[PDB]
Amino acid sequence: AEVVNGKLHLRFAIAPMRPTPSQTIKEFEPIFKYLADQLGATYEIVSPESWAAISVAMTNGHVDVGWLGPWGYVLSNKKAGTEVLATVKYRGEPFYKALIVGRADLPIKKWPEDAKGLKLSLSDQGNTSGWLIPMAYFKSIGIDPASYFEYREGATFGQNESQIQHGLIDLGSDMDRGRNGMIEAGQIDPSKSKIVWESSKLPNAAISVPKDFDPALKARITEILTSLSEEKAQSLMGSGYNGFVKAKHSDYKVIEDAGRILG
């Protein structure tokens, strides 16, 4: 962050919460514009296609305020001391769940013991719900996805849902709040898929700043976001996202723990 020609400038970044960067920016830029306006700041914004990429951007000093996925925040905190200021609310709650979605007609009565050799697609290794949590689940039951499934990694949630719907894979990861938004936007036909597995509750996205971020600004940003009403917040964000709660590192313990156990 710097003051340019007397005017504060902020660099924003948004994780790939919606299926494409343009959708993500169109739907969530307004909360960032609001934030910048409360500070009298200019801004710039990007939304990378992968979850790992926004973590790396924050770690490598390119981002003043980032909306990071949980594992992206934990990784960046470990590497660079990135600080979480607040957690986003979805339907009024600072949590969400990971999914494994399957084709609607997939036999699953003995899941996942009846799924050997099926085509499973996980997301990039920076994706909490899309990679970290499902990998932790398989490892907890002694399954190595790369040798158990016809396995692919690195897909986006948009690719996973599309490929399931069109019969190109059997199984793919998603997150509940993400799937909800895709159904609400008419982007998938939910008759063609079903939830096969859901995780326990996970902490939601981490509104994050670099380690040495200006303390006065940090405090203002936190108050600006957390003081929003549900109605005002929702007016500025994609459907379902409707506020922020003050957060700290220990709120992400379950994610840190999962990452540790996977090495």
- HEC profile of 131-156: HHHHHHHHHHCCCCHHHHCEEECCCC
Alpha helices in the chain (DSSP H): 21-39, 51-59, 70-80, 133-140, 145-148, 157-165, 176-184, 215-226, 230-235, 253-261
Same domain? For 58 and 121 the reply is: no
Same domain? For 134 and 214 the reply is: no
Method by which the model was determined: X-ray
Instruction: Assess contact for 247 and 94: CB atoms under 8 A.
Output: yes
Q: Which of 154, 173, 204 is the last residue before a domain boundary?
A: 204
Q: Which of 156, 173, 204 is the last residue before a domain boundary?
A: 204
Same domain? For 167 and 255 the reply is: no
Same domain? For 225 and 188 the reply is: no
Segment (H or E) for 46: strand 42-46
Same domain? For 83 and 5 the reply is: yes
Query: Resolution in A for the shown PDB structure?
Result: 1.1
- Bond into 112 cis (ω within 30): yes
Instruction: Assess contact for 224 and 38: CB atoms under 8 A.
Output: yes
Same domain? For 191 and 262 the reply is: no
Instruction: Assess contact for 30 and 236: CB atoms under 8 A.
Output: yes
Same domain? For 187 and 137 the reply is: yes
Domain that holds residue 69: 1-94+205-263
Same domain? For 162 and 254 the reply is: no
- Rounded Cα distance, 138 and 145, in Å: 7
> Total domain count for the chain?
2
Instruction: Assess contact for 55 and 68: CB atoms under 8 A.
Output: yes
| 27 token code pair | 């739907």
Q: How far apart are the first and last CA of the chain?
A: 34
Same domain? For 151 and 52 the reply is: no
- Rounded Cα distance, 185 and 169, in Å: 22
24, 191, 256 from 92: Cα distances, Å = 20, 27, 24
Q: Which of 165, 189, 204 is the last residue before a domain boundary?
A: 204
Same domain? For 32 and 66 the reply is: yes
